[PDB]
Protein backbone atom coordinates (compact mmCIF):
# COMPACT_ATOMS: atom_id res chain seq x y z
CA UNK A 1 0.00 0.00 0.00
CA UNK A 2 0.89 3.69 -0.14
CA UNK A 3 2.00 3.49 3.52
CA UNK A 4 4.37 0.56 2.91
CA UNK A 5 7.45 2.78 2.96
CA UNK A 6 6.65 4.57 6.23
CA UNK A 7 7.87 3.32 9.62
CA UNK A 8 5.21 1.83 11.89
CA UNK A 9 6.04 4.31 14.66
CA UNK A 10 5.75 7.22 12.21
CA UNK A 11 2.33 6.00 11.04
CA UNK A 12 1.15 5.89 14.66
CA UNK A 13 2.58 9.35 15.34
CA UNK A 14 0.86 10.75 12.23
CA UNK A 15 -2.44 9.08 13.16
CA UNK A 16 -2.29 10.98 16.46
CA UNK A 17 -1.57 14.24 14.63
CA UNK A 18 -4.43 13.55 12.23
CA UNK A 19 -6.76 13.00 15.19
CA UNK A 20 -5.74 16.37 16.66
CA UNK A 21 -6.41 17.99 13.29
CA UNK A 22 -9.75 16.15 12.85
CA UNK A 23 -8.41 14.67 9.59
CA UNK A 24 -10.09 11.31 10.03
CA UNK A 25 -9.57 10.04 6.48
CA UNK A 26 -5.83 10.57 6.90
CA UNK A 27 -5.98 9.03 10.39
CA UNK A 28 -7.65 5.91 8.96
CA UNK A 29 -5.10 5.62 6.14
CA UNK A 30 -2.23 5.89 8.64
CA UNK A 31 -3.78 3.26 10.90
CA UNK A 32 -4.46 0.90 7.98
CA UNK A 33 -0.78 1.23 7.12
CA UNK A 34 0.14 0.44 10.71
CA UNK A 35 -2.08 -2.67 10.78
CA UNK A 36 -0.53 -3.81 7.51
CA UNK A 37 2.92 -3.90 9.16
CA UNK A 38 1.68 -7.23 10.52
CA UNK A 39 2.35 -6.69 14.22
CA UNK A 40 -0.41 -6.76 16.82
CA UNK A 41 -1.82 -3.43 18.01
CA UNK A 42 -1.57 -2.13 21.56
CA UNK A 43 -4.64 -0.90 23.44
CA UNK A 44 -3.96 2.73 22.50
CA UNK A 45 -3.35 1.78 18.86
CA UNK A 46 -6.64 -0.16 18.69
CA UNK A 47 -8.44 2.97 19.89
CA UNK A 48 -6.81 5.05 17.14
CA UNK A 49 -7.89 2.51 14.51
CA UNK A 50 -11.46 2.39 15.74
CA UNK A 51 -11.87 6.16 16.12
CA UNK A 52 -10.48 6.86 12.65
CA UNK A 53 -12.86 4.54 10.84
CA UNK A 54 -15.82 5.29 13.12
CA UNK A 55 -15.56 8.94 12.12
CA UNK A 56 -15.02 8.28 8.40
CA UNK A 57 -17.97 5.92 8.13
CA UNK A 58 -20.04 8.05 10.51
CA UNK A 59 -19.86 10.97 8.11
CA UNK A 60 -20.68 8.73 5.15
CA UNK A 61 -23.66 7.20 6.97
CA UNK A 62 -25.02 10.61 7.99
CA UNK A 63 -24.79 11.75 4.36
CA UNK A 64 -26.44 8.52 3.18
CA UNK A 65 -29.36 9.10 5.56
CA UNK A 66 -29.85 12.66 4.26
CA UNK A 67 -29.89 11.45 0.66
CA UNK A 68 -32.04 8.41 1.43
CA UNK A 69 -34.64 10.68 3.06
CA UNK A 70 -34.70 12.92 -0.02
CA UNK A 71 -35.01 9.86 -2.24
CA UNK A 72 -37.96 8.51 -0.23
CA UNK A 73 -39.77 11.84 -0.40
CA UNK A 74 -39.19 11.89 -4.17
CA UNK A 75 -40.96 8.52 -4.50
CA UNK A 76 -44.15 9.57 -2.66
CA UNK A 77 -47.52 10.34 -4.23
CA UNK A 78 -47.61 13.80 -5.78
CA UNK A 79 -43.83 14.25 -5.97
CA UNK A 80 -42.51 15.72 -9.22
CA UNK A 81 -40.20 13.40 -11.17
CA UNK A 82 -36.70 14.86 -10.79
CA UNK A 83 -34.83 12.18 -12.75
CA UNK A 84 -32.21 9.65 -11.68
CA UNK A 85 -29.86 12.08 -9.90
CA UNK A 86 -30.97 11.53 -6.29
CA UNK A 87 -30.75 7.75 -6.62
CA UNK A 88 -27.43 8.04 -8.45
CA UNK A 89 -25.87 10.23 -5.79
CA UNK A 90 -27.24 8.13 -2.93
CA UNK A 91 -25.74 5.09 -4.71
CA UNK A 92 -22.40 6.89 -5.04
CA UNK A 93 -22.23 7.63 -1.31
CA UNK A 94 -23.48 4.11 -0.54
CA UNK A 95 -20.78 2.47 -2.67
CA UNK A 96 -18.06 4.56 -1.02
CA UNK A 97 -19.41 3.65 2.43
CA UNK A 98 -19.49 -0.04 1.50
CA UNK A 99 -15.90 0.24 0.32
CA UNK A 100 -14.79 1.59 3.68
CA UNK A 101 -16.69 -1.15 5.51
CA UNK A 102 -15.06 -3.77 3.27
CA UNK A 103 -11.65 -2.26 4.01
CA UNK A 104 -12.19 -2.44 7.78
CA UNK A 105 -13.59 -5.96 7.61
CA UNK A 106 -10.58 -6.96 5.52
CA UNK A 107 -8.14 -5.61 8.11
CA UNK A 108 -10.00 -7.49 10.84
CA UNK A 109 -9.91 -10.70 8.78
CA UNK A 110 -6.27 -10.20 7.63
CA UNK A 111 -5.18 -10.72 10.31
CA UNK A 112 -6.17 -8.80 13.44
CA UNK A 113 -8.82 -11.21 14.73
CA UNK A 114 -6.89 -14.46 14.23
CA UNK A 115 -3.89 -13.11 16.19
CA UNK A 116 -5.95 -11.56 19.04
CA UNK A 117 -5.91 -13.85 22.07
CA UNK A 118 -6.40 -11.53 25.02
CA UNK A 119 -10.03 -10.70 25.77
CA UNK A 120 -9.47 -6.93 25.49
CA UNK A 121 -8.22 -7.25 21.93
CA UNK A 122 -10.44 -10.08 20.71
CA UNK A 123 -13.71 -8.55 21.98
CA UNK A 124 -12.65 -5.16 20.60
CA UNK A 125 -12.03 -6.53 17.10
CA UNK A 126 -15.18 -8.66 17.12
CA UNK A 127 -17.23 -5.63 18.18
CA UNK A 128 -15.71 -3.77 15.22
CA UNK A 129 -16.63 -6.66 12.93
CA UNK A 130 -20.22 -6.52 14.16
CA UNK A 131 -20.29 -2.74 13.76
CA UNK A 132 -19.08 -2.76 10.15
CA UNK A 133 -21.40 -5.58 9.12
CA UNK A 134 -24.16 -3.57 10.82
CA UNK A 135 -23.29 -0.52 8.69
CA UNK A 136 -23.47 -2.76 5.61
CA UNK A 137 -26.87 -3.96 6.84
CA UNK A 138 -28.14 -0.38 7.16
CA UNK A 139 -27.87 0.06 3.37
CA UNK A 140 -28.47 -3.50 2.17
CA UNK A 141 -31.55 -4.35 0.11
CA UNK A 142 -30.59 -7.49 -1.82
CA UNK A 143 -30.27 -11.27 -1.80
CA UNK A 144 -27.41 -11.05 0.72
CA UNK A 145 -29.18 -8.80 3.28
CA UNK A 146 -30.07 -11.62 5.67
CA UNK A 147 -26.52 -12.97 5.49
CA UNK A 148 -25.07 -9.53 6.22
CA UNK A 149 -27.36 -9.24 9.25
CA UNK A 150 -26.38 -12.69 10.44
CA UNK A 151 -22.68 -11.85 10.00
CA UNK A 152 -23.15 -8.84 12.29
CA UNK A 153 -25.09 -10.96 14.80
CA UNK A 154 -22.48 -13.74 14.77
CA UNK A 155 -19.57 -11.37 15.41
CA UNK A 156 -21.43 -9.55 18.20
CA UNK A 157 -22.47 -12.85 19.78
CA UNK A 158 -18.93 -14.24 19.89
CA UNK A 159 -17.74 -10.94 21.38
CA UNK A 160 -20.55 -11.10 23.95
CA UNK A 161 -19.69 -14.66 24.95
CA UNK A 162 -16.01 -13.79 25.49
CA UNK A 163 -16.81 -10.52 27.29
CA UNK A 164 -19.12 -12.19 29.80
CA UNK A 165 -16.55 -14.90 30.57
CA UNK A 166 -13.40 -12.78 30.64
CA UNK A 167 -14.22 -9.15 31.49
CA UNK A 168 -15.86 -7.45 34.48
CA UNK A 169 -19.33 -6.02 33.82
CA UNK A 170 -17.93 -2.47 34.06
CA UNK A 171 -15.28 -2.95 31.37
CA UNK A 172 -15.81 -0.14 28.81
CA UNK A 173 -15.35 -2.46 25.83
CA UNK A 174 -17.91 -4.90 27.25
CA UNK A 175 -20.30 -1.99 27.88
CA UNK A 176 -19.86 -0.49 24.42
CA UNK A 177 -20.32 -3.88 22.79
CA UNK A 178 -23.58 -4.33 24.67
CA UNK A 179 -24.75 -0.82 23.71
CA UNK A 180 -24.17 -1.48 20.02
CA UNK A 181 -25.52 -5.05 19.99
CA UNK A 182 -28.66 -3.70 21.69
CA UNK A 183 -28.99 -1.09 18.92
CA UNK A 184 -28.48 -3.89 16.37
CA UNK A 185 -31.39 -5.77 17.95
CA UNK A 186 -33.59 -2.67 18.03
CA UNK A 187 -33.17 -1.29 14.53
CA UNK A 188 -31.58 -4.02 12.35
CA UNK A 189 -33.00 -7.30 13.67
CA UNK A 190 -36.52 -6.06 14.48
CA UNK A 191 -36.11 -7.25 18.10
CA UNK A 192 -36.86 -4.24 20.34
CA UNK A 193 -37.62 -6.46 23.34
CA UNK A 194 -34.19 -8.08 23.07
CA UNK A 195 -32.64 -4.63 22.65
CA UNK A 196 -34.30 -3.33 25.81
CA UNK A 197 -33.53 -6.45 27.85
CA UNK A 198 -29.86 -6.36 26.86
CA UNK A 199 -29.51 -2.66 27.68
CA UNK A 200 -31.24 -3.07 31.05
CA UNK A 201 -29.32 -6.17 32.15
CA UNK A 202 -26.00 -4.64 31.07
CA UNK A 203 -26.71 -1.43 32.97
CA UNK A 204 -27.82 -3.21 36.16
CA UNK A 205 -24.84 -5.58 36.24
CA UNK A 206 -22.42 -2.70 35.70
CA UNK A 207 -24.07 -0.71 38.51
CA UNK A 208 -23.44 -3.61 40.90
CA UNK A 209 -19.71 -3.77 39.99
CA UNK A 210 -18.88 -0.05 40.25
CA UNK A 211 -17.82 -0.49 43.88
CA UNK A 212 -14.66 -2.37 42.85
CA UNK A 213 -13.33 0.51 40.75
CA UNK A 214 -10.96 3.41 41.22
CA UNK A 215 -12.23 6.94 40.60
CA UNK A 216 -10.78 6.98 37.07
CA UNK A 217 -12.23 3.60 36.10
CA UNK A 218 -15.56 4.60 37.67
CA UNK A 219 -15.68 7.66 35.42
CA UNK A 220 -14.86 5.57 32.33
CA UNK A 221 -17.57 2.96 32.99
CA UNK A 222 -20.36 5.34 34.03
CA UNK A 223 -19.95 7.29 30.77
CA UNK A 224 -21.08 4.35 28.61
CA UNK A 225 -23.67 3.39 31.22
CA UNK A 226 -25.31 6.77 30.62
CA UNK A 227 -25.55 5.90 26.92
CA UNK A 228 -27.36 2.66 27.81
CA UNK A 229 -29.72 4.68 30.00
CA UNK A 230 -30.23 7.24 27.22
CA UNK A 231 -31.29 4.49 24.84
CA UNK A 232 -33.59 2.91 27.41
CA UNK A 233 -35.24 6.30 27.97
CA UNK A 234 -35.74 6.75 24.23
CA UNK A 235 -37.18 3.25 23.80
CA UNK A 236 -39.49 3.08 26.83
Amino acid sequence: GAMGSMERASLIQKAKLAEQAERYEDMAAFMKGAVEKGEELSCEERNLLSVAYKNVVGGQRAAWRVLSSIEQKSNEEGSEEKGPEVREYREKVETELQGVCDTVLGLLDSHLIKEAGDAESRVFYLKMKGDYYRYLAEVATGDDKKRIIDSARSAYQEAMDISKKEMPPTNPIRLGLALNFSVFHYEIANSPEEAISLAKTTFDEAMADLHTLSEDSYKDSTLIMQLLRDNLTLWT
Binding site: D131, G176, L179, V183, L227, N231, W235
Partner: peptide, 5 residues
Protein backbone atom coordinates in the same frame (compact mmCIF):
# COMPACT_ATOMS: atom_id res chain seq x y z
CA UNK B 1 -30.91 9.79 18.01
CA UNK B 2 -30.03 6.54 19.78
CA UNK B 3 -26.45 6.13 20.93
CA UNK B 4 -23.75 3.79 19.65
CA UNK B 5 -20.06 3.93 20.52
Amino acid sequence: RRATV
